[PDB]
Amino acid sequence: GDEVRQIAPGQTGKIADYNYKLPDDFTGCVIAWNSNNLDSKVGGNYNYL
Amino acid sequence: SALGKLQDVVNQNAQALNTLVKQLSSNFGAISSVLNDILSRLDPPEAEV
Amino acid sequence: RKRISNCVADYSVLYNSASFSTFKCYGVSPTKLNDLCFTNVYADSFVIR
């Protein structure tokens, strides 16, 4: 939930650096929702890397 | 002061050139009047303004 | 307040540290911070709401 700001274009971070980056002149829409009830696991859900 | 007519033309041209040069030191609202200084401080999306 | 001076500053570790919920630079960019020279640096520490 913190990395949504990196998901915003023209930013800097670990994701914006070597996981997912966007153009400075990006056009389109960004859409997000909480996926706790569908992804969270008591173990820790380490499937997402 | 016999050749004031020619001296006026020379002075006007020199002074217009000097004012044009001096206009390079104005901020015009930017953080600095130096292009290199602006580029060496801000990242590609913020330096553009 | 503390006048930090006569030292080499590595802001890369500070930027990479993920403990910070807020990290905003208002006159420079954190990536470009390591390439700049400063006359003196101030550090103000406090706990707010």
Query: What's the CA gap between C32 and B40, in Å, rounded?
Result: 7
**Residue B27: strand pairing partners:** none
Picking from A2, A12, A14, the nearest residue to C31 by CB comes out as A12
Please, which experimental method was used?
A: cryo-EM
Main-chain phi, psi angles of B8, to 5 degrees: -65, -45
Q: Is C31 on the interface with A (CB under 8 A)?
A: yes
Contacts with C31 from chain B: Cβ below 8 Å: 43
Q: Which residues of A20-38 are buried (b: 16+ CB within 10 A; e: fewer)?
A: ebeeeeeeeeeeeeeeeee
Q: Are B41 and C27 inside 8 Å of each other by CB?
A: yes
Q: Which residues of A touch C (CB under 8 A)?
A: 2, 12, 14
Residue with tokens 């009047």: B33
Contact B41 C36 (CB under 8 A): yes
- The data reach a resolution, in angstroms, of 2.7
Cross-strand bridge partners of residue C3: C42
DSSP code of residue A2:
T
User: Does C11 contact chain A (CB < 8 Å)?
Assistant: no
Q: Touching A: which chains, 3+ CB pairs < 8 A?
A: B, C
Q: What angle do CA C5, B47, A17 make, to 5 degrees?
A: 80
